[PDB]
């Protein structure tokens with residue numbers, strides 16, 4: 001696709017938001033329904049590598065996305081987490097925030113992925 | 125102290141950074157050495173409640189603090205996480221980021237707390 005996420009290209013079909021500096025995508029394997037990712041467009045490996053503007057944008061974007069997924073996927077809270085570094089569990093070497101809708105007491109095809117990204121693009 | 129964190133006052137002695145809109149403090153019970161918190165100065169309960177500027181500042185501040193604690197406490201990575209909402213585990217109703225230094229294979233007195241905050245104020 002047209003979005004770079006580490007060492008693989010992400011098809012726009014699975015991207016549901018894109019800003020001046022960041023973008024959001026749905027997962028192949030969500031851990032929880034609505035588990036989405038907000039990444040800087042520039043593929044940097046560690047958080048300290050982002051310029052301040054990328055940082056403000058990374059998180060103002062994460063704020064908008066969280067509202068949307070909490071809403072759509074019917075959660076009552078949200079967990080945000082960034083595994084920054086190999087000893088923190090980062091599998092893909094690209095800064096990214098995990099946004100997961102939370103609710104009391106708690107793999108798919110590219111098409112299920114794009115169906116969901118289509119849905120999410122509506123809230124923006 | 126002079127910092128508000130939910131429904132209790134935090135003594136400045138345990139605060140090691142303060143910006144135009146945010147502040148960082150050390151914990152009574154760190155989960156991992158160097159486990160610190162970055163909160164908006166304005167006590168808001170959920171992340172969606174922050175204005176965009178508070179958001180940029182919350183995270184540009186978290187970026188600086190992470191560099192410092194990763195350095196001082198000898199970690200090789202960092203875990204960042206915000207439990208946003210009661211179903212996400214938020215015990216204190218004040219937006220806040222948990223910053224934890226990570227390293228391969230992984231309660232105290234107000235004085236141990238201020239000793240550590242003194243140390244951290246040096247890196248700024």
Ligand SMILES: OC[C@H]1O[C@](O)(CO)[C@@H](O)[C@@H]1O
Pocket residue numbers: 033072073074
């Ligand atoms: O997956 C979340 C979406 O699916 C439903 O539960 C059923 O279609 C919706 O109303 C919600 O928005």
Ligand SMILES: OC[C@H]1O[C@](O)(CO)[C@@H](O)[C@@H]1O
Pocket residue numbers: 157196197198
């Ligand atoms: O607690 C972290 C700090 O403690 C030491 O391991 C011993 O004093 C330091 O060199 C480090 O900066």
